[PDB]
Each structure stands twice: as C-alpha cells, then as structure tokens.
From a paper:
In low G + C Gram-positive bacteria, CodY is a global regulatory protein that controls the transcription of numerous genes. CodY from B. subtilis and most other low G + C Gram-positive bacteria is a DNA-binding protein that is activated by the branched-chain amino acids (BCAAs),2 leucine, isoleucine and valine, which may be viewed as signals of the metabolic status of the cell, and GTP, which may signal the energetic status of the cell. CodY from B. subtilis consists of 259 amino acid residues. The structures of full-length CodY from B. subtilis determined here reveal the effector binding domain and the DNA binding domain as discrete entities separated by a helical linker.
We have solved the structure of unliganded CodY in three different crystal forms containing 14 (form A), 10 (form B), and 2 (form C) molecules in the asymmetric unit from data sets extending to 4.6, 3.0, and 3.7 Å spacing, respectively. The following descriptions relate to the structure of the form B crystals, because these crystals diffracted to the highest resolution (3.0 Å). The full-length CodY protomer has an elongated structure that spans 80 Å in the longest dimension with a dumb-bell shape. The 12 residues (156–167) that link the previously reported GAF and wHTH domain structures are in an α-helical conformation. They extend helix α5 in the GAF domain and connect it to what was previously named helix α6 in the wHTH domain, thereby creating a single α-helix spanning residues 137–177. Within the CodY chain, there are no non-covalent interactions between the domains that exist as discrete entities. Examination of the molecular packing in the crystals of unliganded CodY reveals that the basic building block of all three crystals is a tetramer. The GAF domains exist as two pairs of dimers flanking four wHTH domains. To facilitate comparison, we superimposed the wHTH domains of one of the chains (chain A) of unliganded CodY and Ile-bound CodY(L3S) onto one of the corresponding domains of QsrR, FadR, and IscR in their DNA complexes and observed the juxtaposition of the recognition helix in the partner wHTH domains and the DNA. This simple modeling suggests that the unliganded CodY dimer, in which the recognition helices from each chain are related by a 25 Å translation and a 40° rotation, could bind to a DNA duplex of ∼20 bp.
Residue numbers in the entry:
A (entry chain H), B (entry chain A): 2 to 256
The structure:
C-alpha cells in the first residue's frame, strides 16, 4: 500500500497548487500517511506547523510547542544534523546531539529528517512515535514528505518576493512617467495628506504650492491609471484619495 | 535497495539546484535508477529529453524521436491519459488509446506517467522495457521521477518568460524616455543599420534626415544608459553600435 501512500502525498502536493501554503494541513496529511507525530521546524528553528496522533511525555518538546520555537541551543544542534537520523530514543549512543540536549529523546522514538531544497538547508522535519520502529518504508515516506514541504517553503517565499518586488517595480515605473511638476505635485499632496487616506481641495493646493490644478489632477490620474491610487471627487469643494499600493508611500519617501 | 534508489533521485534533484535544467541528464539518471528507457514529452507533446538503455523495435516511437515531436493525434491522446498507466503492450485491452494508435505499443512494455505540477498537466513521462514488468517499486520511482521533472519544467519555463518579458519591459521603459526627435532618430538609425551590429557616421545621418547630430547622439546615449545598446566611436569618420537586447529590434518594428 506504499505506492498508494506516496500517491496521497503526490495528490496533496498537486492539491496545494494555487493556494497559500498551509503547514498545519501538510502536517496532518503526513501524520496520517506515515502514522506518527509530525513537526515542521524552520532553518531559524521556528515551529511552522505540526500534527499529533499519539501523546508522548516529553518536556522539552511540549515546551518547544508552547514557545512555538526552539532555543538557539537546539536550533543549532538540529541544523547540524547533516542527514536523516532515525529511531533515536534516550538510550541512543550516537554523535548528533551533546549529552545535555538528549532530553529531546526523553521518551519514545524520534526521527530527524533535514528539509533540503533549492540548495539550502531549509529546516527540519521531526517525527515521533510512542514505540513503533521507523522501518524503511516510513523513511521513504518521511523523506518524500520533507522533500515536498521543502518545495512549499520555496513556493511560499518565492511568491513573497514576487509580490514585494512587483509592487515596488510598478510604483517606480509609474513614478518614472511623471513630469517634474507632476511629481512635485504628488509629493506636496502626500506631504499634505494624513497617511493612507484623506481628502483635499485640489484647487487650494494649486495656489498654496504654485502648480496648476490641471496638472495636479493629471498627476493623480497617472497614479490612478497605474493602479497605485484610487481617486473620487465630490463635485469639488473636495477631492478624495486612497492608496492601494502599500509600497507606494514608502517609495515616495525615498526621494 | 529501493530507499537508496529514491535517494538517488533525491540527490539528483538537489544537484540540479542552481544549474540550467537539463532533461537529457535527468533522463539518464532515471534510465539508470528505474532500469528502463525514459522519454520526457511536453504538454504540447514536444520531446524534451530522453535516454535509452535497451533497444526496442518501435516505428512509431523512432519516428517520434526523429521528429523530436508527436503528431497532434497522439499528443492529444497522450494528454487524455489521466493517471499512471502501466505495462501496456500490443495485447493490452483497455481504454486509453484508440486502436489506430495502438502502434505505440508495437513492441515491449510501456508505462505512462502524467507529469503534473503547479496544478497543471505539464507533460508526460514515458518508460519502456523490452520485457521486464513494471512492479510497484518501479512505479514509485517513476512517479517520484515525474514529480521531480515537474518542478523543473516549471522552473525552466518560468525563467524563460521572466527573461523574455523583462527584456521587452526595459526596452519599452527606455523608449518611453525618448523625445519625438530622439525616437525619430533611433528609427532611421536602425532602418539604416544592417541588423544587430555595424557603424555609421552620426553627422551624415543628421543631414540626410534633418535632425541635429547632437540629439541623434543623445538618443543613442539614452539607449545605452538603459543597457539596450553598446556604443563606441572611432574619433568620428565613424561611430559603431551593437544591440545588447534581443527584444529591442523587434519592439522597434512594432512602431
């Protein structure tokens, strides 16, 4: 039924497709397929997701869960595990962890799989059982699992930078197309405006600043047509604006 | 030794990391691990890579290889296989292929794994053997294999459109910065130039066309400053230019 088991993980990957990464979800699916407690811990050792199907009396663990994080101590110790290590209990004679960190295997069997992707140690996958051995098939699953979670940390962060940069880009591209006086205007406007939103009299700034209303508006138009702001007038004696690009205001500061 | 077999795939993936996707290589690695002929065919049914370890008398396939492509016929039929289909020979009674495409199984055992990733059917992985059956362990590997190829087809195509676009984008942005006269100049320059490279006398076009050297120059500057072209003079009685943006010439046409 192993083929089938891997097939699940396959479909769970295929499923997460266009949808924001959910670690808790993945944690569960693994928990189910491999039949073990599942813990997903970042490079920096932060707890990213987890799922439990058997209670295991472990202080260090419970504390870590409460903390949603590992102490630097362990975090490092963990990162230093270079490859899958399996079936570690408190009796395990081995290298990976120094004596005073063995409280991690206080009870039950633990397996450590590094999460590697995009040529980086991305984090670590922790599995624990009360007493059932991790045989090879388990390991296969666990490893495939970690591999998949890898690809998600990647998708996750990749999506992240694409947004950040794209938005910034667009702002710049828009700003670029401003005349001196247009930009001059925009600057004065948001110098005047009280953050993300608010309204002002276009025709008033025009006098106050020494720039035709016609261009002030024009400038607004450009920003709007690039989708950075949203503007609606109120039969003048008012015109109102909200920014729709979170990077915009910051970028504007940089000049 | 299955675990080990998967682990190869694993490190093959991890290996491809920062390096340009190569399908022939992956083909080989899978050929090796699965112990079967491997062919990687796109959504559009193009041949992407392949590797052979055993000769099989199959005209349809030899033909396909020569063509580096399938006929729309098969391409379609292939795409319609919704999930892994295994050990299909000429005698197989089943649904997947209409009997006029049976010539596909002319000889030996064929197995088809759809390549799915990022929520799309990305292509198809085809494996063939002269007579050894595909057991589950093979299918696990073959499927893990397809999966890996997946994220690569993705990466490859993604990188592809990121370059295409970015180039185009920057051309436009640079064009955007030009005066009527400046642009007019550019246009006559490349109308005069014979493709990607060559030289002319700036001062000559100036009279020929009715635009000051001074601006013709400055137009070139602008382009260069944006990294579109590369310009070096030769103490006049010559100035020389090379386009560094493959999209630029094309875009220019579109005006």
């Amino acid at each position: 039924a192993l083929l089938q088991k891997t097939r699940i993980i396959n479909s769970m990957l295929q499923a997460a497709a266009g949808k924001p990464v959910n670690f808790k979800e993945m944690a569960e699916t693994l928990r189910d397929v491999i039949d073990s407690n599942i813990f997903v811990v970042s490079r920096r050792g932060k707890l990213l997701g987890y799922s439990i199907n058997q209670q295991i009396e472990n202080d260090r663990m419970k504390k870590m869960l409460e903390d949603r994080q590992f102490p630097e101590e362990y975090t490092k110790n963990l990162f230093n595990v270079p490859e899958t290590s399996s079936n570690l209990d408190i009796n395990s004679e081995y290298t990976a962890f120094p004596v005073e960190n063995r409280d991690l295997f206080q009870a039950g069997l633990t397996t450590i799989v590094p999460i590697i992707g995009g040529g980086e140690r991305l984090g670590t996958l922790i599995l624990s059982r009360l007493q059932d051995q991790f045989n090879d098939d388990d390991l296969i699953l666990a490893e495939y699992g970690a591999t998949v979670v890898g690809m998600e940390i990647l998708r996750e962060k990749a999506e992240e930078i694409e947004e950040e940069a794209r938005s910034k880009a667009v702002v710049q591209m828009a700003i670029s197309s401003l005349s001196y006086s247009e930009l001059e205007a925009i600057e004065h406007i948001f110098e005047e405006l009280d953050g993300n939103e608010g309204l002002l009299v276009a025709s008033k700034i025009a006098d106050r600043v020494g720039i035709t209303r016609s261009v002030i508006v024009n400038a607004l138009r450009k920003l709007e047509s690039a989708g950075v702001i949203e503007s609606r007038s109120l039969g003048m004696k008012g015109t109102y604006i909200k920014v729709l690009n979170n990077k915009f205001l910051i970028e504007l500061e940089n000049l």
